[PDB]
Structures are given as structure tokens and as C-alpha cells.
Structure 1
Amino acid sequence: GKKLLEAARAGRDDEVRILMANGADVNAADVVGWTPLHLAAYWGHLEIVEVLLKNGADVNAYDTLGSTPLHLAAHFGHLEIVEVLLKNGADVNAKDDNGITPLHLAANRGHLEIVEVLLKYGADVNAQDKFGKTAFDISINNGNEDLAEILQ
């Protein structure tokens, strides 16, 4: 499974293939709680995210700070991966230890397409973080008008 965490990070589709077909834990977690899915989501490896989920990867796995792969994908603007994760039952309103949601993150980075998908899947627009901020609050603060209008 240590082989899997690494292969997942490097986006070695073929290698994930084996290890997979040799029964490596698909939900293997590293020192910070990241699974192979967190890693593929972060580094933008769509094909590996797909395989992983097809092999029973916990889609709502969370790291030691309560963050899920959907958080990572939404934050780093991986639209494809966001769609795939949601289609596989990713909790759209997942909150990390800070009360931060994938919607908060996408909104912060101004990822418009992604923000729309999340909403599509029923992301709660009024969800507040620990500081009581909504994605709307964020869009306003960043002076992002195209985004603020949507959150409406």
C-alpha cells in the first residue's frame, strides 16, 4: 500500500493497475491521513482517480485535518475529478476541522465551472465556516462579481 500511495502520486496508471490486482489496500493512508485518492485528486490524476474508485476506494476518506479528496480537487480546479468524485457519492457538503467545504475552496480560488457542479449536486450555499463565512462572503471579499452573482 506504500507502493500504491507513491504510484498514485506520480500518476502511474499502469502501476496502480498491478498493486490493485495484487490486493494493496486501496484506502492505505500516509502520515497525514492522505489516501491514494487524496493524492491523485491533489496532483490532478483523473485516470487514476477513476481506477481507484472502481476498486472500492472510500470516496469520503478524510485526512488528519478532516479534509476529503473532493476538498483537494475543488480547491485545485480539477473539474473532471470533481465530477467523477460526486458521481461516486462524494459528500458535497463535507466539512474539514475548520468548517471549510469544497464550495468554500472552489469559491476562494474562483473556480467557476467547479462551483456550478457543486451547486448542481446540492452544495449548501449558506454553509458557514468556523469564522461564519459563506462562499458568498468569500466571493464578495475577493471582489469576484462573476462568482458572487452565481451564488445567488
Structure 2
Amino acid sequence: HHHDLGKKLLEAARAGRDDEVRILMANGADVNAADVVGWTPLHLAAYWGHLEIVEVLLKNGADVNAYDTLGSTPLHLAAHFGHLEIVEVLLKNGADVNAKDDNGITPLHLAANRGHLEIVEVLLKYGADVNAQDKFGKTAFDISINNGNEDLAEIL
């Protein structure tokens, strides 16, 4: 899971260039090409919220559960930054809903921290362990108490 055209694809997937990613995928570019920090084109597409590119890469066999060098997956990034549509599609294609990074942080933790209520519901819907704790022993509910998010604490 720790992964020129492969480097062309990573730049195209970041800037949202839907035509060029189709061009490079049709020319044998590596779908799972990683940069120096371990981010794949799926990582960058999930980070910068490019939904169409997400679906294109997973169609061509992109590792939905790719790890970066700190253990973070594209579902971590999508849940952290409020990209609900991508969070859905990632879970559709077998994204580990309980993936922990090196800190023990799950996508539920990140969605809870930034208060993305709808994403928290989609993650729970797919079986996210509501009692998963990070390295500091914090659950998604602990995060809502410290943040004062009464709406989140009720959803949980």
C-alpha cells in the first residue's frame, strides 16, 4: 500500500485537468505513482476535491487504500476537508472506513474535528468504529465535546 508519465499524472490530477488524466491513462501512465511524501494521484484528487478525476482513476485500478509515508489514505483527506461526494465514491470502491494513520487517527476523527456532519453520517453508515481512539485516547465523541459541537455529539 506504500507505493515521467507517472509524474505527469500526479501533476494533472492535482490541478483538476480532466482531459490530460484521460490522455495519460490511455497511454500507460502508472495509476499508483507516488511522490516524495507518498501521495498518489488519488491522494491529490481527494485532497483538492476533484470528483471526476477520483472516479476516473479508481476505474483504472487506483489503490483506494493507498498509504502515504505517515499512514494517511485518500479517505482521510476527503473526510478531513468536507468532500462528501468523494467520501461516498471512495467507500463505494472499498475504502477502509477504519483506516488509522501513524497517529491512530481515523477518517471519522478528522471529519468530526472539522465538523463535517454529513460525512460523519456516511462514515458511520459504512461501519466506522465510533469508539476508535487515536494515540492520545480520544474518540470522535471526545472531539465533539472539546469542540462544543452539540450537533455532532447527538449524531454520535
Q: TM-score, normalised by structure 2?
A: 0.96
Shift of 1:125: 0.2
Shift of 1:14: 0.6
Counterpart CA distance in 1 for 2:145 and 2:155 is: 12
Counterpart CA distance in 1 for 2:104 and 2:81 is: 18
Counterpart CA distance in 2 for 1:145 and 1:101 is: 21
CA displacement, residues 32-54 of structure 1 (integer Å, 9 cap, x when unaligned): 00000000000000000000000
Pairwise CA RMSD: 0.3
Counterpart CA distance in 2 for 1:65 and 1:51 is: 25
Aligned match for 2:97, one of 92, 100, 105: 92
Shift of 1:111: 0.1
Counterpart CA distance in 2 for 1:124 and 1:44 is: 25
What is the SS of the residue equivalent to 2:34?
Answer: coil
Shift of 1:18: 0.8
Corresponding residue for residue 45 of structure 1: 50
After the TM superposition, which segments of 4 or more aligned residues of structure 1 sit over 6 Å from their partners? none
Corresponding residue for residue 73 of structure 2: 68
Counterpart CA distance in 2 for 1:22 and 1:13 is: 15
The percent of aligned pairs where both chains have the same amino acid is 100
Counterpart CA distance in 1 for 2:106 and 2:22 is: 31
Corresponding residue for residue 106 of structure 1: 111
What is the SS of the residue equivalent to 2:111?
Answer: helix
Corresponding residue for residue 54 of structure 1: 59
Consecutive unaligned residues in structure 1, runs of 5 or more: none
Counterpart CA distance in 2 for 1:13 and 1:92 is: 27
Counterpart CA distance in 1 for 2:60 and 2:137 is: 38
CA displacement, residues 82-121 of structure 1 (integer Å, 9 cap, x when unaligned): 0000000000000000000000000000000000000000
What is the SS of the residue equivalent to 1:93?
Answer: coil
How many residue pairs align between the two structures?
151
Counterpart CA distance in 2 for 1:69 and 1:81 is: 9
Consecutive unaligned residues in structure 2, runs of 5 or more: 1-5
